Motif scaffolding. Sequence first.
Motif, PDB file in Angstrom:
ATOM      1  N   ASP A 151      -0.927  -6.531   8.950  1.00  0.00           N
ATOM      2  CA  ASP A 151       0.004  -5.598   8.370  1.00  0.00           C
ATOM      3  C   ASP A 151       1.401  -6.139   8.288  1.00  0.00           C
ATOM      4  O   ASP A 151       1.918  -6.895   9.123  1.00  0.00           O
ATOM      5  CB  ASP A 151       0.008  -4.313   9.222  1.00  0.00           C
ATOM      6  CG  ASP A 151      -1.386  -3.745   9.307  1.00  0.00           C
ATOM      7  OD1 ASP A 151      -1.970  -3.661   8.237  1.00  0.00           O
ATOM      8  OD2 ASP A 151      -1.707  -3.450  10.442  1.00  0.00           O
ATOM      9  N   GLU A 176       0.801  -1.202   0.000  1.00  0.00           N
ATOM     10  CA  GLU A 176       0.000   0.000   0.000  1.00  0.00           C
ATOM     11  C   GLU A 176       0.835   1.254   0.000  1.00  0.00           C
ATOM     12  O   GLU A 176       0.437   2.244  -0.634  1.00  0.00           O
ATOM     13  CB  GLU A 176      -0.876   0.107   1.260  1.00  0.00           C
ATOM     14  CG  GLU A 176      -1.929  -0.982   1.266  1.00  0.00           C
ATOM     15  CD  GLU A 176      -2.768  -1.149   2.488  1.00  0.00           C
ATOM     16  OE1 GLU A 176      -2.131  -1.140   3.588  1.00  0.00           O
ATOM     17  OE2 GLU A 176      -4.002  -1.306   2.405  1.00  0.00           O
ATOM     18  N   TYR A 196       5.112  -0.985   3.073  1.00  0.00           N
ATOM     19  CA  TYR A 196       4.089  -1.355   4.020  1.00  0.00           C
ATOM     20  C   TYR A 196       2.830  -1.828   3.310  1.00  0.00           C
ATOM     21  O   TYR A 196       2.386  -1.238   2.305  1.00  0.00           O
ATOM     22  CB  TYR A 196       3.791  -0.131   4.830  1.00  0.00           C
ATOM     23  CG  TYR A 196       2.801  -0.366   5.945  1.00  0.00           C
ATOM     24  CD1 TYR A 196       3.188  -1.009   7.113  1.00  0.00           C
ATOM     25  CD2 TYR A 196       1.472   0.065   5.805  1.00  0.00           C
ATOM     26  CE1 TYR A 196       2.304  -1.236   8.153  1.00  0.00           C
ATOM     27  CE2 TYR A 196       0.593  -0.170   6.855  1.00  0.00           C
ATOM     28  CZ  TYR A 196       1.006  -0.815   8.021  1.00  0.00           C
ATOM     29  OH  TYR A 196       0.137  -1.051   9.054  1.00  0.00           O
ATOM     30  N   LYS A 202      -0.854   7.894   3.610  1.00  0.00           N
ATOM     31  CA  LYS A 202      -1.317   6.604   4.007  1.00  0.00           C
ATOM     32  C   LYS A 202      -2.424   6.109   3.100  1.00  0.00           C
ATOM     33  O   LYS A 202      -3.580   6.556   3.282  1.00  0.00           O
ATOM     34  CB  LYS A 202      -1.868   6.749   5.434  1.00  0.00           C
ATOM     35  CG  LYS A 202      -1.497   5.628   6.324  1.00  0.00           C
ATOM     36  CD  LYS A 202      -2.492   4.554   6.425  1.00  0.00           C
ATOM     37  CE  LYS A 202      -2.049   3.459   7.428  1.00  0.00           C
ATOM     38  NZ  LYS A 202      -2.765   2.199   6.986  1.00  0.00           N
ATOM     39  N   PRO A 204      -6.900  -6.535   7.260  1.00  0.00           N
ATOM     40  CA  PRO A 204      -5.839  -7.580   7.138  1.00  0.00           C
ATOM     41  C   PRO A 204      -4.561  -7.242   7.868  1.00  0.00           C
ATOM     42  O   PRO A 204      -4.146  -6.112   8.140  1.00  0.00           O
ATOM     43  CB  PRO A 204      -5.626  -7.662   5.605  1.00  0.00           C
ATOM     44  CG  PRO A 204      -6.969  -7.262   5.053  1.00  0.00           C
ATOM     45  CD  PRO A 204      -7.422  -6.151   5.954  1.00  0.00           C
TER      46      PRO A 204
END
Lengths: 175, 175, 175, 175, 175, 175
Positions: D70, D20, D55, D29, D68
């Motif tokens: 990480d 991501e 990440y 983010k 989910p």
Amino acid sequence: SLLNVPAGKDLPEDIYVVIEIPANADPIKYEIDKESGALFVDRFMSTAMFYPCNYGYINHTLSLDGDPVDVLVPTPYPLQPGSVTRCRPVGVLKMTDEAGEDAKLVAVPHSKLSKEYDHIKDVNDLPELLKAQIAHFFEHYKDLEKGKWVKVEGWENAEAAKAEIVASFERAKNK
Amino acid sequence: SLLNVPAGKDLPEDIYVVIEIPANADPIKYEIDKESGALFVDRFMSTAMFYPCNYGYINHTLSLDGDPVDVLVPTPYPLQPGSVTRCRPVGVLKMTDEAGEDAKLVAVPHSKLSKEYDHIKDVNDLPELLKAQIAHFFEHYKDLEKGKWVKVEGWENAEAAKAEIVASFERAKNK
Amino acid sequence: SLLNVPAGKDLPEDIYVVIEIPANADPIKYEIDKESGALFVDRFMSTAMFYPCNYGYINHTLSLDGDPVDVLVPTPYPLQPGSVTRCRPVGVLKMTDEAGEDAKLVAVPHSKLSKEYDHIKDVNDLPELLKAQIAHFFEHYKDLEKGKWVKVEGWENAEAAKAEIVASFERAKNK
Amino acid sequence: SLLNVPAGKDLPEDIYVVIEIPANADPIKYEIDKESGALFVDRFMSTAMFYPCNYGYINHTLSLDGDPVDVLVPTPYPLQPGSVTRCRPVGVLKMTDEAGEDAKLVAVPHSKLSKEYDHIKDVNDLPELLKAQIAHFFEHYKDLEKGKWVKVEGWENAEAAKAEIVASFERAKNK
Amino acid sequence: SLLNVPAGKDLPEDIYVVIEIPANADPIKYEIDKESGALFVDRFMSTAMFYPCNYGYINHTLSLDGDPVDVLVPTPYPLQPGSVTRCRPVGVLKMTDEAGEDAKLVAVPHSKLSKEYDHIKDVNDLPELLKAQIAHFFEHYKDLEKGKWVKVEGWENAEAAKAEIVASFERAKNK
Amino acid sequence: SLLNVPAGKDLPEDIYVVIEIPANADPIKYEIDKESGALFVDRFMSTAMFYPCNYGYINHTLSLDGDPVDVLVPTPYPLQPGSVTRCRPVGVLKMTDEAGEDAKLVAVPHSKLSKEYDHIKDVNDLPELLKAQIAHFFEHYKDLEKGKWVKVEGWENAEAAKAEIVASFERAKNK
Ligand SMILES: [Cl-]
Ligand SMILES: [Cl-]
Ligand SMILES: [Cl-]
Ligand SMILES: [Cl-]
Ligand SMILES: [Cl-]
Ligand SMILES: [Cl-]
Ligand SMILES: [Cl-]
Ligand SMILES: [Cl-]
Ligand SMILES: [Cl-]
Ligand SMILES: [Cl-]
Ligand SMILES: [Cl-]
Ligand SMILES: [Cl-]
Ligand SMILES: [Cl-]
Ligand SMILES: [Cl-]
Ligand SMILES: [Cl-]
Ligand SMILES: [Cl-]
Ligand SMILES: [Cl-]
Ligand SMILES: [Cl-]
Ligand SMILES: [Mn+2]
Ligand SMILES: [Mn+2]
Ligand SMILES: [Mn+2]
Ligand SMILES: [Mn+2]
Ligand SMILES: [Mn+2]
Ligand SMILES: [Mn+2]
Ligand SMILES: [Mn+2]
Ligand SMILES: [Mn+2]
Ligand SMILES: [Mn+2]
Ligand SMILES: [Mn+2]
Ligand SMILES: [Mn+2]
Ligand SMILES: [Mn+2]
Ligand SMILES: [Mn+2]
Ligand SMILES: [Mn+2]
Ligand SMILES: [Mn+2]
Ligand SMILES: [Mn+2]
Ligand SMILES: [Mn+2]
Ligand SMILES: [Mn+2]
Ligand SMILES: [Mn+2]
Ligand SMILES: [Mn+2]
Ligand SMILES: [Mn+2]
Ligand SMILES: [Mn+2]
Ligand SMILES: [Mn+2]
Ligand SMILES: [Mn+2]
Ligand code: NA
Ligand code: NA
Ligand code: NA
Ligand code: NA
Ligand code: NA
Ligand code: NA
């Protein structure tokens, strides 16, 4: 210091260009300070435009605008501000700005740096798109700066570029 | 050389800032070497943090920490390490670090470079988010460096910033 | 797929914008393909200009130009092509291009994503420089594309932006 | 769609991680939308910090935080948001955030992608600096987000990471 | 000027490296001009290769190739051309090129800049992949430059690196 | 999904190329997953080399190597992984790798995207430097990957490229 770089190995066909702004960079106009040799911010440009080539000047020269003659250098990767590249002139965009006659030379990397541009002999060898983009940039980049402006006369050949370089060299040599 | 750049055109309202670290850059702390005028690597920072603005100093000045006074310069695009920008002070983050009193000035690009920050007159005109991010950065960037630390006293106005600049100029002028 | 993203949580004040072009990017005009949901290259732009903000559209909407309504999203860092951002409309640049009426909405990140733009309530809260740069971009970016053109009518407020969004949503809902 | 990527070839030692956020990126983010499979902006982070590694998450898994599990993936070059990398777990940073237990796995590129990390067998093989930087990031990145927080319990070994992955897989399989 | 930077604090274990080319950069070979201290473009490299580490030299030294001895510096983030980093030698790739014996030192950031490389004591502590990539780069980067070539003898230890540095320092001190 | 993009508007002269790797990018080899349509990391390349052009494939085609036929697309700015560009074939580098016959097509942006490459009609119109760099890349990029290799047969014209595309389309249509 950058202050001590020569105009060139063999003026006007074999020149050195001090780069101030990289190709495809943010719209920050840097200038080298003749005082200190340092790169100073001259302007944060207000238009959403970028120099279409690396941009800089020939040391020990002077345009009517009061600063060394300006040069556009196409290269395969953007150059570092403050760096110097050996170049060969191939054309010139004649233009005037609010501070004086202000021609924009186009000079390609010297064959000793690369063979890539050896086939660019004169102004008509430059891509039409690139020349159009350059002219369009100088015509509009100051569109949001009150009191600054540009008038583009037009593209001329290498022979004219070279004459420009000789005239600029002389004007510095005695003025 | 960068060694020869003036503190400013008109101290303390009209200053020059030598940039050492660009905004939104990798966590490499560069410092200019008073010996050679060259940019030296001082530290590879250990925390996953970045300077929230361009960072540098005012030449011919000295903080209690032994180096020229430090300045944060917000700009619309990150500046080049080694470049100089004409700025106007608007606020200051008072703080001390393990090497001495170590104020962080905030100075915006001079209106001659851009009209963008002309509306930032004093410290309360700075975005709250930006001030918070700056303070938070100085509080934590040395969190993984043993023996280094920071204590943030707080944000003060342009008048204090300017006083800071005058005091820093004097301390260099005789020390 | 991007094809399935909603127009918004709460049209017209709470919208989702699909980003096609990042802020301060190379001059490649991407479009999402309504067929496949893939990002296609529409044009390599010929002018040395860049979108002044992230650029994209509101899904399930349609402008007179035949595609979803267009949106400019300022953000502190450029967004990823293909990403979606929750936004709040604050103004609109009315303009027409060779394919139909072609308004450019300005929508800021939703306060749930950041507090940074909460103070931008309506069009006059946008920086004058940014609005000028946007208008100047749409006026000139197609200057070297024969057969393409733009006519900029002018900046209108959030209320108009919102009306634009409702009209665009309806036109898709039945056409 | 990313919605259809498997948790892994051979859970828990042979996994796939959906990325991501790239390593050393701007502080945006992104989250994948379980609805559409699209990358959505979740937050513009307010601190001047960056994720120390790429990440993302393991698909078809669920943490107590509701999303989910990480994963941090170190790599020699940052990955593309939206990409998937085959990985092998080597350690885990146990921590809780305001939304539930929220462990951060560390998984290295599978030897089939590179031999570079084959020597990282378990958590003590990870560089101390990197582990410190990771923990420090999760401890402070939400420092300017009211109502959000983190409590870092501590680093555990690969065996724990793997158990984490199995528990996360089950919790999704029936919840 | 860069011309005045010392070879080192404590030759040969404590050196300064002037960086000419950043790690993971475009294929432009810059050299510092002993005349002016400016960064000059030496070559636009023709192969699709990049220096695997930051690359530069030790000032006040001379290799058989006629220029200061060359150094590769791995770092966590690429360095600025023109910057100087304090380093500690750990190994050397012996090789010859068309201009003379032309060893490539590997020196890591000094522990005073970071603790990251303190565990790299000697050549066998360098990652095998990195050493392979370095050798492969010098073997092939000039593959498309007629008249230029490389012959790689092989990797030697820190003790040899250091001897190299002493010999290079002397050769400059009297030649 | 990318899975649904057509091979082309008018095969073989008018094609679509799905991009997996941008020009002048880090050495990460991405592949699209025929399962999910997602971009997967295939390899972290071990050599310090980069794809000299954007790299990808034509959908609904198959090479002897088992995957869609591969294409190099030069463009003025690097493309986004996952994007699709309309292209026109002009030449092909015939070569075999450890997984089968594995020709590398060269296709330029369609004149509808730009006029820049309209003058590239056939393989001899491609810059010699670029062709040399491409061949050199495929010859050496796997030099540090045991068990992988390349044998470059040579450059052929547009007519051959087109034949390649037709043969690849058929082989997918029934296999
Ligand atoms: Cl001269
Ligand atoms: Cl001008
Ligand atoms: Cl023209
Ligand atoms: Cl002064
Ligand atoms: Cl400090
Ligand atoms: Cl604060
Ligand atoms: Cl909807
Ligand atoms: Cl438009
Ligand atoms: Cl306007
Ligand atoms: Cl699964
Ligand atoms: Cl978290
Ligand atoms: Cl830790
Ligand atoms: Cl010395
Ligand atoms: Cl060499
Ligand atoms: Cl080796
Ligand atoms: Cl098809
Ligand atoms: Cl291949
Ligand atoms: Cl060839
Ligand atoms: Mn000027
Ligand atoms: Mn000039
Ligand atoms: Mn001018
Ligand atoms: Mn001028
Ligand atoms: Mn210091
Ligand atoms: Mn300082
Ligand atoms: Mn300090
Ligand atoms: Mn200080
Ligand atoms: Mn369109
Ligand atoms: Mn649109
Ligand atoms: Mn339009
Ligand atoms: Mn439109
Ligand atoms: Mn979340
Ligand atoms: Mn998550
Ligand atoms: Mn969380
Ligand atoms: Mn989580
Ligand atoms: Mn050399
Ligand atoms: Mn050298
Ligand atoms: Mn050499
Ligand atoms: Mn050498
Ligand atoms: Mn493959
Ligand atoms: Mn392929
Ligand atoms: Mn292959
Ligand atoms: Mn293939
Ligand atoms: Na003007
Ligand atoms: Na500390
Ligand atoms: Na036009
Ligand atoms: Na918080
Ligand atoms: Na050669
Ligand atoms: Na091989």
